[PDB]
Amino acid sequence: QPQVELFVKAGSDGAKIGNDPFSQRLFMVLWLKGVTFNVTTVDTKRRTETVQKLCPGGQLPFLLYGTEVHTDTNKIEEFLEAVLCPPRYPKLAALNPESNTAGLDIFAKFSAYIKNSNPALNDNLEKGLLKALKVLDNYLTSPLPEEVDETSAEDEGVSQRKFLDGNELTLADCNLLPKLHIVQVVCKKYRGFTIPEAFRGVHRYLSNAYAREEFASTCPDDEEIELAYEQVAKALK
Structure with a gap:
């Protein structure tokens, strides 16, 4: 399985889960697929060098899948539904x-x-x-x-x-x-x-x-x- 990392909006302390129903939607999709994945919160006022290099456009949420970066929540979900598929992962549509x-x-x-x-x-x-x-x-x-x-x-x-x-x-x-x-x-x-x-x-x-x-x-x-x-x-x- 290629590495799967979701980058999501951090909250008021720059670390906890922030308000963002798009980040949450994708966290739920990944959880329901049963894939191994990480989730990294992002303080947009204090970005890491890593995040700045992966996604210089700065969009959140974003997904790293293998070495490929995806933005646009709806497109990310369509990509995950397609690529994480049976028999290893269930279809969620x-x-x-x-x-x-x-x-x-x-x-x-x-x-x-x-x-x-x-x-x-x-x-x-x-x-x-x-x-x-x-x-x-x-x-x-x-x-x-x-x-x-x-x-x-x-x-x-x-x-x-x-x-x-x-x-x-x-x-x-x-x-x-x-x-x-x-x-x-x-x-x-x-x-x-x-x-x-x-x-x-x-x-x-x-x-x-x-x-x-x-x-x-x-x-x-x-x-x-x-x-x-x-x-x-x-x-x-």
Whole structure:
């Protein structure tokens, strides 16, 4: 196996995991592949000579695979899915195309909601975020083609699958989960907003994700995420 090294964003102390859902997505992909890999955090104000030479463009995250450097998170993920393949490593792509688009609009709705300071607009932006979360909830609770089995009498027609595409984490989850993590942490801290309990699909999904080391161990600390948003999350005024 060629050497695999992921270079990721460091946090406020220049060493710990920083806020960056792109770095986290790729850490999750590599973990799910079962490949041996290293992960090196990068303080962009205090780069090492090594990092400056590997990637003088300075993009983060970046991947060293053998002696080849890759940038652009989406391209890095496509490369890893192709080159780390069966039989030694599992294919992580979703089977159902809609798994790859469900929930993708949430992060932009969240960003607008937290950056806004116009009080009159706040309830509109909160509703936009709730509606995008509800569309994700409806996807998670809709049975996929691989599910044709009876459901409990109490939850007929409700999918109980663990993750976006089925019972295994896929590339789709590696993209979405780090973004939902930010959404939940930042909205709690700066908007007093919580995902309604009635969004039972979304809450089952997050609970199942947090119980998995691939997601839990690659999350930045809540404090780091809160600090990252401290000067952009605006109070209504």
